């Protein structure tokens, strides 16, 4: 009926990422199996328009059905584990196996990489994703 679940992704040594525009890092897969999901981030954006941003997407990796509908929310955890800078889908999106949905302009690199803003404690970026399938 309703299935809600989450995944915390810690990306270590974030400041050292050498990904150029268009290059991707994928997380490990996770589930609530049947369905398998992963997160995917472009540290230097998906394209020229988003070069100044991290792009963050949810990918349906494996799926027994033709399609699944899911709402999602991504946030960044601070040193206290508190969610900050969240973006949420305003409705459910249609995933098929191999389809992603997310935010091309999730967070400004010039904000995230300034350590005084407190989102890279010990140079780790911690993302938190919550997914609901109805």
């Amino acid at each position: 009926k309703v299935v809600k679940f989450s995944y915390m992704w810690t990306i270590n040594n974030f400041s050292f990422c050498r990904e150029e525009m268009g290059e991707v890092i994928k997380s490990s897969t996770f589930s609530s199996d049947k369905l398998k999901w992963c997160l995917r981030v472009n540290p230097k954006g998906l394209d020229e328009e988003s070069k100044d941003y991290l792009s963050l997407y949810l990918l349906l990796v494996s799926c027994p059905k033709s399609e699944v509908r899911a709402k999602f929310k991504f946030s960044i955890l601070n040193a206290k584990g508190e969610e900050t800078k969240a973006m949420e889908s305003q409705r459910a999106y249609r995933f098929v196996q191999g389809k992603d949905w997310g935010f091309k302009k999730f967070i400004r690199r010039g904000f995230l990489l300034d350590e005084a803003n407190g989102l890279l404690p010990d140079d780790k970026l911690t993302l938190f994703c919550e997914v609901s399938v109805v």
């Binding site: 998906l46 999106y93 992603d100 949905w101 997310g102 935010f103």
Partner: peptide, 8 residues
């Protein structure tokens, strides 16, 4: 910045 899109 808050628009949902897909890479495909």
């Amino acid at each position: 910045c808050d628009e949902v899109t897909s890479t495909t």
